[PDB]
Amino acid sequence: SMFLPPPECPVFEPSWEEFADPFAFIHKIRPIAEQTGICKVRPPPDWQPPFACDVDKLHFTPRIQRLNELEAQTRVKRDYTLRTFGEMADAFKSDYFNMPVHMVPTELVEKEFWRLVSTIEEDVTVEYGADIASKEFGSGFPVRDIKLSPEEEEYLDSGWNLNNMPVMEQSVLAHITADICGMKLPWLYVGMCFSSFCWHIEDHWSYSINYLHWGEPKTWYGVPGYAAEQLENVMKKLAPELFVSQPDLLHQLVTIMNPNTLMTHEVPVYRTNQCAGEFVITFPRAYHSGFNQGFNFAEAVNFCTVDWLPLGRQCVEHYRLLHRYCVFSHDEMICKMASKADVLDVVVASTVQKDMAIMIEDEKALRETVRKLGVIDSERMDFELLPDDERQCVKCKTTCFMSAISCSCKPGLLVCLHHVKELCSCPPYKYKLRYRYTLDDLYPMMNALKLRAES
Ligand SMILES: [Mn+2]
Ligand SMILES: [Mn+2]
Numbered sequence: 001s002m003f004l005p006p007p008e009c010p011v012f013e014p015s016w017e018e019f020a021d022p023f024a025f026i027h028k029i030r031p032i033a034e035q036t037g038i039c040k041v042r043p044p045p046d047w048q049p050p051f052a053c054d055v056d057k058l059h060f061t062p063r064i065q066r067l068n069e070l071e072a073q074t075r076v077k078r079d080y081t082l083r084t085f086g087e088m089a090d091a092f093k094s095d096y097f098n099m100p101v102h103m104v105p106t107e108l109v110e111k112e113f114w115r116l117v118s119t120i121e122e123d124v125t126v127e128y129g130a131d132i133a134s135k136e137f138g139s140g141f142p143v144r145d146i147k148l149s150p151e152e153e154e155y156l157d158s159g160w161n162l163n164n165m166p167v168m169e170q171s172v173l174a175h176i177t178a179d180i181c182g183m184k185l186p187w188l189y190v191g192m193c194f195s196s197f198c199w200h201i202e203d204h205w206s207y208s209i210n211y212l213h214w215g216e217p218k219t220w221y222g223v224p225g226y227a228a229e230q231l232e233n234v235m236k237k238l239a240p241e242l243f244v245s246q247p248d249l250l251h252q253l254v255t256i257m258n259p260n261t262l263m264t265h266e267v268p269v270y271r272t273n274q275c276a277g278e279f280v281i282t283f284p285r286a287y288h289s290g291f292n293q294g295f296n297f298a299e300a301v302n303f304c305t306v307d308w309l310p311l312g313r314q315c316v317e318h319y320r321l322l323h324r325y326c327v328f329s330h331d332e333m334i335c336k337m338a339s340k341a342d343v344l345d346v347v348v349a350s351t352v353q354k355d356m357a358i359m360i361e362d363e364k365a366l367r368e369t370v371r372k373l374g375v376i377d378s379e380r381m382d383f384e385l386l387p388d389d390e391r392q393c394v395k396c397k398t399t400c401f402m403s404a405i406s407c408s409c410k411p412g413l414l415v416c417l418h419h420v421k422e423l424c425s426c427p428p429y430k431y432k433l434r435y436r437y438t439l440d441d442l443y444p445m446m447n448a449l450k451l452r453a454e455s
């Protein structure tokens with residue numbers, strides 16, 4: 001009829017044994033879940049992290065949201081307490097349906113959501129909270145600081161405590177010394193009925209994991225990584241405005257779009273209702289979107305496993321082709337890890353070694369190419385010391401680290417080695433190759449990884 005629900009995504013109910021190590025578990029389910037893009041994880045029944053907060057002392061600045069299909073919204077960006085938001089949220093839903101909120105069936109809210117976003121005559125606006133953990137509003141999980149109860153202490157070091165998972169043994173994102181707070185810290189989300197997250201994939205094609213601490217469910221739609229470009233082609237045809245070049249990371253355009261539209265164009269889509277106490281995990285380059293069924297409170301964080309490393313490299317290549325800004329330098333991350341080879345997990349070391357080999361071979365070829373273009377002069381340069389906005393390629397916006405080209409003619413400007421012709425009109429003999437490492441510096445770094453991997 002008017003909305004046909006996508007098939008359900010995989011749901012996993014790990015034993016305590018399986019659940020004990022999140023990264024082991026995620027690797028285990030990956031062959032299944034990567035075919036659906038998202039999956040849901042129900043922790044063991046007795047894994048129950050305690051949640052406690054004063055609803056009157058937690059306050060936040062609400063974002064306002066129009067609910068129109070295909071309309072452009074910006075991705076990342078009054079004052080409520082948690083109590084006053086809750087009161088607004090419950091009344092909104094109660095008044096919308098002329099029902100008590102627990103009586104409103106989830107399938108009805110879903111059907112109605114897709115009706116109202118598609119109808120021009122309706123102009124429903126809703127509000128929500130989205131912000132990284134701060135002193136005004138912290139994690140929903142226990143954090144060390146305030147005398148904690150024994151039950152809180154039990155969950156302090158859990159891999160599934162989303163504060164840990166970042167610095168947790170296997171997110172290569174942990175090792176990044178660069179400032180990436182917006183991407184590495186957990187985000188807190190206060191939802192209300194119909195408040196929604198537009199179709200998107202994570203920066204650098206990372207994983208994400210979302211925990212619903214309490215409240216009414218969050219409805220999700222997800223698309224497997226292998227269908228990412230199919231989805232973008234559908235979107236581009238129906239809403240080209242979203243695909244124009246953007247001046248920076250703070251201007252990414254995203255939109256609401258009916259999953260049935262994707263399914264009509266043979267893009268595979270899965271759904272789920274995430275309830276309180278459940279996790280949803282999104283996989284690399286898996287498009288996802290959704291909306292809240294009512295007043296709720298969620299927490300989510302990005303992470304990167306060793307499975308992800310090659311995709312991370314591919315993603316930055318993709319950003320270059322699109323002239324998209326990077327959140328961090330992938331090569332910088334790889335070299336930081338190489339410089340710490342002795343303390344790396346051995347499987348991590350082994351996987352980093354493989355990416356590094358590709359990095360070095362690509363870098364070798366690029367340097368040979370720019371030499372043949374007539375760039376002769378060179379000087380070592382510690383790229384990691386420059387603010388990001390001072391080491392982006394003029395042309396493709398990539399964050400430089402391995403090397404770049406400069407010219408005294410254009411002080412402070414840089415191009416990556418793919419865009420030597422785009423820096424200025426001076427002949428290439430006026431240029432300098434700025435490089436972080438010689439090829440001779442690099443091979444021993446990679447050898448340290450091999451030794452650590454015992455290889
Ligand atoms: Mn509408
Ligand atoms: Mn997301």
Ligand SMILES: [Mn+2]
Nearest residue numbers: 320321395396
């Ligand atoms: Mn180009």
Ligand SMILES: [Zn+2]
Nearest residue numbers: 393396416419
């Ligand atoms: Zn470039």
Ligand SMILES: [Zn+2]
Nearest residue numbers: 407409424426
């Ligand atoms: Zn010049």
